[PDB]
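TEACHING EXERCISE
Course module: macromolecular assemblies
Task: Read the component lines below, then compare them to the predicted structure of the full complex.
Student: A.B.
Group: 4
Components provided:
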Amino acid sequence: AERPTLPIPDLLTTDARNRIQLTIGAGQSTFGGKTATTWGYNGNLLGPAVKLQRGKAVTVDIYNQLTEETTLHWHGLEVPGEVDGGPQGIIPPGGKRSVTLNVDQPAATCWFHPHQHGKTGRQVAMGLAGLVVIEDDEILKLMLPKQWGIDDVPVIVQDKKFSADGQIDYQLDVMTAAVGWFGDTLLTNGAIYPQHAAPRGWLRLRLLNGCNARSLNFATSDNRPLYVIASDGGLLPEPVKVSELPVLMGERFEVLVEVNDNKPFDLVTLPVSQMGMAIAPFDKPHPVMRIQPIAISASGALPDTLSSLPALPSLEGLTVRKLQLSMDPMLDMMGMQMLMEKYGDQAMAGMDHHMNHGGKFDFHHANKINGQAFDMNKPMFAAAKGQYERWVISGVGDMMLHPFHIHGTQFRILSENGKPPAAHRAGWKDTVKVEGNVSEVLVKFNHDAPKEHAYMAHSHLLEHQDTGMMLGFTVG
Ligand SMILES: [Cu+2]
Ligand SMILES: [Cu+2]
Ligand SMILES: [Cu+2]
Ligand SMILES: [O]
Ligand SMILES: [O]
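Instructor-supplied answer key:
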């Protein structure tokens, strides 16, 4: 059979009441011919791409048609805590919440997803995620590929696993609280190995790793390069040519890739050195999508310069905040041994060469920051507004992957896990790798967040977030 075409999320803009309507609901999807209950925004699975313009405000009306509580967070968008949609931003089942977003940051591909307390991993796994396309005046002058669904395409890559009856098989248990929820089936905008027909010339891909726990590493099947033009928070100063592009959970990059007549090629993900993630079929390069060239000229450009990146300031005299991540040693070893028992030595491929004892030992609060599992009632500190800070995040003490995300900002990485950041990671980021080492980022918060609607900072390995590896903080 031919491959299905890559599904393209609808690009949604406001009505004359300046409103965008998002309905959160359950429906059905099909994967490998078997139906599964799934959740979506304005549909059965995934969600639309909300289009925003710098300097314009939009109101979003969010209708929760699930039978459980949820929240809606705009990952990458810098907004006041009251509309950030962290775990305090509850939307009752059958209820509606509206937020007004006053967009105040450069053009970027951001995304949105649930942030329900202790249940974010399940709600993402069931299907909820959407996109945000921010434009500003600067980016349109560059004449990048811009025809949505033709030469400018979002690529949301996610794994799932399913039970024998076809349903999504999600469990937050000791093994996944240790290693994360991951599966054996790769989805690309919800579809298994789709094709996308693209015109000859440049193709812009807005890549999102939407997996709960799996890191990815994109490349092409015939080793043509990817030209990185943007990271989480917007354009780089100039394109950065790469042969492979590691992407952590929740990160975005936009790349341009050449499309040549008569030569289809795949976007692939290459095996990663992360526990559990190189079990078949991920022990080998895995196709994500086939690009099918069409013999019609594509109009977009890859300009020499994209934007101005300001200089890092002096670090002297900046507040230094220490964030020590930790996992419970006994429960990390138990979960890792369950993984090994299940899959054997392949569960560590690529890596460097039973009774109830009560609430004290419960894995639901095993993961922590500064010795505390997330306490929604007690923000850990009060950050400065409009002031740079140096946040130092340590994963010393364990070797698991912690893509560390901070709400309310786009930051600059000073050190990523003990090395200066790669050039394509040296611009605006909202995620930094922490794995067995220490990262340092330079952050500034331009908006307030009170205790009742605090900003979060957490690992975006969702099963770790949901079992305590998150803190709240206020601004202003
Ligand atoms: Cu996120
Ligand atoms: Cu976020
Ligand atoms: Cu978050
Ligand atoms: O987030
Ligand atoms: O998040």
